Design a protein around this nucleic acid. Structure first.
Length: 95
RNA sequence: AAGAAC
């Protein structure tokens, strides 16, 4: 057997900023994404105990009829020279 | 190097 996920493979509105360079936060990411459309919510997650931060984020929009472009434009954008990840995440919403 | 929640 084999696998390729860790949670419910049913995304639909969970955009995000995976590997957000670990030098940026949701108060900065909410502004640059607000340029492409309205924003419903934003999140950045870490670990519960140790092994340092998981260092990544999720983003949500009130309409996907326009958030679809926020995904295609902001993907691989420059933020720390890392060409960050921006698109659907998986598992829709928090735990 | 990307990654898992609350």
């Amino acid at each position: 057997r084999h696998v390729g996920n860790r949670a419910n493979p049913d995304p639909n509105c969970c955009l995000g900023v995976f590997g957000l360079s670990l030098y940026t936060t949701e108060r900065d990411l909410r502004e640059v994404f607000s340029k492409y459309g309205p924003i419903a919510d934003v999140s950045i997650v870490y670990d519960q105990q140790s092994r340092r931060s998981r260092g990544f984020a999720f983003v949500y929009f009130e309409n996907v009829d326009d958030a679809k472009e926020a995904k295609e434009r902001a993907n691989g954008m420059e933020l720390d020279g890392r060409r960050i990840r921006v698109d659907f995440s998986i598992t829709k919403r928090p735990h």
